[PDB]
């Protein structure tokens, strides 16, 4: 996990990613192929995304995709067998914004399709750490870009994030950005990864932020460390 | 019809790309818009039928 077969070379103001350099990135689409959210593969049978994306078993997980405008590109359209929404998700405060998707048929890992590592509940990723977020969300606050995008951004301390968002920032949230880039419509559920001993680890899940996708305001993500115990328990019981 | 039918569509703070319907009083019909996934206002429906039955004629 966390080691791309194809090394990446480093969303508003982001840049085009190297084809297949973020193998855990999946696209969540409806029965017609309409992209509504991103997601991250944590192993061959499970995808982790945001609770607010409202995924159902009628939706599909598309893995190994780079250019959504390419009908030739080889991808994997995985059916969803069951959806596990964290019962703690607060539809009012948006806290505990995480959902797990169990695939009907396992994904066939390869050079362009693999898993991201999960952190330990006790991991501490310091403010200032340069992480990365990826997705097919809008590049300007408007249709989604065809090719997967990426952006490097810094994690922010809770104190610094609150200087802007105040008490809307809850215990299962972590902020990053306000550095010239911003997540935007279509990026939700996607990953915010940072290196842990060299392996890309899921530190956040794109959740919410500026109503205008401003690049000078903190982006908010679901804090995976505060939710990974729930993830592990869900896996073990299913 | 309820007055919430006269409010413009609200995407919200979340960043998903979910197709929803809202009633456009100026045109007299329900149209699609992109919803962020959280904190929906009431002029936001999962189907065009729901929207017309609730806001039609507003």
Curated annotation (Swiss-Prot), chain A:
Q: Name one GO biological process term.
A: proteolysis
Annotated Gene Ontology cellular component terms? extracellular region; serine protease inhibitor complex
What GO annotations for molecular function exist for this entry? serine-type endopeptidase activity; serpin family protein binding
- Protein keywords: Digestion, Disulfide bond, Hydrolase, Protease, Secreted, Serine protease, Zymogen
Q: Please give the InterPro entries that the UniProt record associates with this protein.
A: Peptidase_S1_PA, Peptidase_S1_PA_chymotrypsin, Peptidase_S1A, Trypsin_dom, TRYPSIN_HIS, TRYPSIN_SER
SS bond partners:
1-117, 37-53, 131-194, 161-175, 184-213
Q: Which CDD domains match?
A: Tryp_SPc
The record's similarity note reads: Belongs to the peptidase S1 family.
Specify the protein name.
Answer: Chymotrypsinogen A
Q: Name the source organism.
A: Bos taurus (Bovine)
From Swiss-Prot, chain B:
MF terms from GO for this chain are: calcium ion binding; molecular function inhibitor activity; potassium channel inhibitor activity; protease binding; serine-type endopeptidase inhibitor activity; sulfate binding; zymogen binding
Residues carrying the site annotation Reactive bond for trypsin: 15-16
The record's disulfide annotation reads 5-55, 14-38, 30-51
Where does the UniProt annotation locate this protein?
Answer: Secreted
A single Gene Ontology CC annotation of this entry is: serine protease inhibitor complex
Instruction: Please give the name of this protein.
Output: Pancreatic trypsin inhibitor
Name any Gene Ontology BP term.
negative regulation of serine-type endopeptidase activity
Q: Where is the BPTI/Kunitz inhibitor domain?
A: 5-55
Q: Shown portion of the whole protein?
A: 36 to 93 of 100
**Protein purpose:** Inhibits trypsin, kallikrein, chymotrypsin, and plasmin.
The entry's keywords = Disulfide bond, Pharmaceutical, Protease inhibitor, Secreted, Serine protease inhibitor, Signal
């Amino acid at each position: 996990c966390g080691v791309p077969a194809i090394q990446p070379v480093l969303i508003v103001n982001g840049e085009e990613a190297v084809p297949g350099s973020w193998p855990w990135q999946v696209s969540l689409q409806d029965k017609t192929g309409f992209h509504f959210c991103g997601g991250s593969l944590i192993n061959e049978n499970w995808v982790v995304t945001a609770a607010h994306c409202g995924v159902t078993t009628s939706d599909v997980v598309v893995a190994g995709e780079f250019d959504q405008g390419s009908s030739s590109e080889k991808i994997q359209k995985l059916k969803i067998a069951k959806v596990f929404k964290n019962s703690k998700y607060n539809s009012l405060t948006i806290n505990n914004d995480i959902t797990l998707l169990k695939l009907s048929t396992a994904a066939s890992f390869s050079q362009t399709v693999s898993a991201v590592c999960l952190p330990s509940a006790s991991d501490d990723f310091a403010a200032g750490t340069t992480c990365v977020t990826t997705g097919w969300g809008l590049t300007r606050y408007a249709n989604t870009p065809d090719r997967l995008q990426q952006a490097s951004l810094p994690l922010l301390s809770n104190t610094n994030c609150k200087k802007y968002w105040g008490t809307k920032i809850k215990d299962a949230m972590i902020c990053a950005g306000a550095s010239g880039v911003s997540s935007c419509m279509g990026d939700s559920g996607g990953p915010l990864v940072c290196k842990k001993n060299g392996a890309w680890t899921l530190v956040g899940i794109v959740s919410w932020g500026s109503s205008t996708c401003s690049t000078s305001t903190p982006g908010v993500y679901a804090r995976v460390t505060a939710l990974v115990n729930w993830v592990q328990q869900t896996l073990a019981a299913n | 019809r309820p007055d919430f039918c006269l409010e413009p569509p609200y995407t919200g703070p979340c960043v998903a790309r979910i197709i929803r319907y809202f009633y456009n009083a100026k045109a007299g019909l329900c149209q699609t818009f992109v919803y962020g996934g959280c904190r929906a206002k009431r002029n936001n429906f999962k189907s065009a039928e729901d929207c017309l039955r609730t806001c039609g004629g507003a």
